[PDB]
Amino acid sequence: MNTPKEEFQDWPIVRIAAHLPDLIVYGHFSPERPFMDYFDGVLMFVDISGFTAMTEKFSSAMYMDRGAEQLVEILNYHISAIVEKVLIFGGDILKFAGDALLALWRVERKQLKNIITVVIKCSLEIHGLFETQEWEEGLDIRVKIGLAAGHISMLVFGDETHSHFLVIGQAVDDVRLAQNMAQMNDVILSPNCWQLCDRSMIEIESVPDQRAVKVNFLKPPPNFNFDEFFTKCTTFMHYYPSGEHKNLLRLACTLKPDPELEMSLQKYVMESILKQIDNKQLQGYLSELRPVTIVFVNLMFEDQDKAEEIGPAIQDAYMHITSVLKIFQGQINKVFMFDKGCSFLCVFGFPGEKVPDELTHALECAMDIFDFCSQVHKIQTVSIGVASGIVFCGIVGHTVRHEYTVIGQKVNLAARMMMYYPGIVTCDSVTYNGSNLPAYFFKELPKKVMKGVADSGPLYQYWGRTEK
Ligand SMILES: Nc1nonc1C(=O)c1cccc(OCc2nc3ccccc3[nH]2)c1
């Protein structure tokens, strides 16, 4: 008998799993909302803003209307190399944003020490990818890396058709603090990462006015062999591709059709992405430079450090947010959480969802979300930034691990406005002028100097319809 090889491995369920971490793909938890779980791990935060700041120049007429296509091509070329490093060193890419990716090595407490060594070596090899790299003069094709370790909480929230997850807690807070202290080419360890690490492996230096540390060198002991050490570490890595599947980047590439599993996983993925997965939309339709309105919603909690309290509050806010967005075909693109604010990146005018009066509707939707979430138990402060303009939209990442992402100055501006003007709804000049709403519905704001924004233009508070 003949023995033809190569199984089919391009099923819809596999294409869906590319959009999700192993944390979700192999998660098998209750469909109850909110769901919370607790574990330990090492977190890696890779700041990729250095090369995603490329977006505004790809709007230049020099790119002859192929700006979005060239942008996603060069972005994915560089991001795929980072992704391959994380995956081969045994990490799980949790999420992509325009400015960062976050990765997790989930492990039992006893193994934190050795796993930190694996993650430091991975971090240094990521920097190694960009050591002699540039385009057109500027060599800002480099990264900054923050590492944390310790207790991690997971939250899954959503309704009967959509799901979202977050990792939260002190190690999550720590990894963002570590990454913010980093300069180009740095690897920063959180204080707890440094307290838990194998100090014989590494040479550090102090960070001024900080308990966090910078890695100068990984200088192993004399008889150390990283390959044999890594093999020992794989004992604790549940989904590391092995044996017959050692040639694959992800075990998720071996997923077989399972309708109950697929029903669960598709809830995390936008319908237009599912349409492409199902071969009912051209594979390149979602890569575009597109005018959108960003509505960036930040929620700050009474007790920041209480996972048990914030879970129901995010769920209650989500239930209201999703009902208000449905009304104008607004979408939640991402949910993020670090400085204990939970942030919803909402988008109006995505592909096939663009409708007249985007601007008025985005403002009314922001006000509605603001009023409801302010009355939600345990939510201390709601802040909403609204910015409109040309943003890049596209699937960002590696073939085996990628996400639909929005990138652009107006994304960064809405994110900065909600942090710099807390407790209010703010909008940019485009939204204000284009709403055509009466001038007295707004308040002209003092100009603030905001991180990573230069010519922000006049900013406004959306006061609303009444003096009250
Ligand atoms: N927690 C989380 N659980 O899963 N993913 C989380 C997360 O936070 C994350 C993941 C990947 C990238 C990322 O980018 C940094 C960022 N955080 C932002 C907050 C507000 C505005 C803009 C922001 N950019 C964040």
Give a three-class secondary structure readout of the chain: CCCCCCCCCCCHHHHHHCCCCHHHHCCCCCCCCCEEEEEEEEEEEEECHHHHCCHHHHCCHHHCCCHHHHHHHHHHHHHHHHHHHHHHCCCEEEEECCCEEEEEEECCHHHHHHHHHHHHHHHHHHHHHCCCCCCCCCCCCCCEEEEEEEEEEEEEEECCCCEEEEEECHHHHHHHHHHHHCCCCCEEECHHHHHHCCCCCEEEEECCCCCCEEEEEECCCCCCCHHHHHHHHHHHCCCCCCHHHCCCCCHHHHCCCCHHHHHHHHCCCCHHHHHHHCCCCCCCCCCEEEEEEEEEEEEEECCCCCHHHHHHHHHHHHHHHHHHHHHCCCEEEEEEECCCCEEEEEEECCCCCCCCCHHHHHHHHHHHHHHHHHCCCCEEEEEEEEEEEEEEEEEEEECCEEEEEEECHHHHHHHHHHHHCCCCEEECHHHHHHHCCCHHHEEECCCCCCCCCCCCCCCEEECCCCCC
CA of 150 to the centre of ligand 1 (A): 18
246 and 143 housed in the same domain: yes
Cα–Cα–Cα angle for 147, 76, 173, rounded to 5 degrees: 25
- Quick one: CA torsion of 430, 433, 437, 439, rounded to 10 degrees? 120
**Is-cis flag, bond preceding 221, omega within 30?**
no
For residue 261, tell me if it sits in a domain.
no
Cβ contact 52:100 at 8 Å: no
172 and 78 housed in the same domain: yes
Length of the chain: 468
Of 252, 273, 296, which residue constitutes the final position of a domain?
252
Ligand 1, pocket-test mutation among 36, 43, 95, most atoms within 8 A of CB: 95
Q: Is 385 exposed, middle or buried, given 0-12, 13-18 or 19+ CB atoms closer than 10 A?
A: buried
CA of 101 to the centre of ligand 1 (A): 8
425-427 and 460-462 strand pairing = antiparallel
Residues 433, 100: Cα–Cα separation, whole Å: 32
65 and 156 housed in the same domain: yes
Q: Would you say the CB of residue 46 lies under 6 angstroms from ligand 1?
A: no
- Quick one: CA torsion of 295, 300, 304, 306, rounded to 10 degrees? -70
Cβ contact 364:379 at 8 Å: no
Residues 136, 237: Cα–Cα separation, whole Å: 41
Q: Would you say the CB of residue 102 lies under 6 angstroms from ligand 1?
A: yes
Resolution reading in Å:
2.0
Nearest 5°: phi and psi at 19? -85, 0
Amino acid (1-letter code) at residue 161: T
Q: Would you say the CB of residue 94 lies under 6 angstroms from ligand 1?
A: yes
248 and 297 housed in the same domain: no
Largest pairwise CA distance in the chain: 83
Cα–Cα–Cα angle for 68, 338, 464, rounded to 5 degrees: 75
146 and 41 housed in the same domain: yes
CA of 402 to the centre of ligand 1 (A): 15
End-to-end CA distance of the chain: 82
For residue 149, tell me if it sits in a domain.
yes
The two tokens of residue 66 are: 């192929």
Q: Is 109 assigned a ligand-binding role in the annotation?
A: no
Residues 259, 449: Cα–Cα separation, whole Å: 51
Method by which the coordinates were obtained: X-ray
Nearest protein CA to atom 4 of ligand 1, as residue: 166
- CATH number of domain containing 83: 3.30.70.1230
For residue 262, tell me if it sits in a domain.
no
240 and 332 housed in the same domain: no
Those residues with Cβ within 8 angstroms of residue 48's Cβ, 6 or more apart along the chain or in another chain: 79, 82, 99, 100, 101, 143
193 and 327 housed in the same domain: no
142 and 236 housed in the same domain: yes
For residue 14, tell me if it sits in a domain.
no
Cβ contact 351:290 at 8 Å: yes
Residue 65's Cβ-side half-sphere holds a number of Cα atoms within 13 Å equal to: 0
How far from 78 is each of 71, 101, 136, 186, 283, CA to CA, in Å? 11, 13, 16, 18, 20
- Its sign, for the CA torsion 425, 431, 436, 440, is positive
38 and 135 housed in the same domain: yes
For residue 173, tell me if it sits in a domain.
yes
Q: Would you say the CB of residue 405 lies under 6 angstroms from ligand 1?
A: no
Q: Would you say the CB of residue 338 lies under 6 angstroms from ligand 1?
A: yes
Residue 315's Cβ-side half-sphere holds a number of Cα atoms within 13 Å equal to: 17
Amino acid (1-letter code) at residue 278: D
120 and 208 housed in the same domain: yes
227 and 358 housed in the same domain: no
Ligand 1, pocket-test mutation among 333, 336, 342, most atoms within 8 A of CB: 336
For residue 321, tell me if it sits in a domain.
yes
- Number of domains composing the chain: 2
Nearest to 290 by CA among 331, 325, 324, 326: 331
Domain span holding position 173: 34-252
CA of 436 to the centre of ligand 1 (A): 33
For residue 270, tell me if it sits in a domain.
no
Cβ contact 251:241 at 8 Å: yes
114 and 203 housed in the same domain: yes
Of 252, 276, 304, which residue constitutes the final position of a domain?
252
379-398 and 425-427 strand pairing = parallel
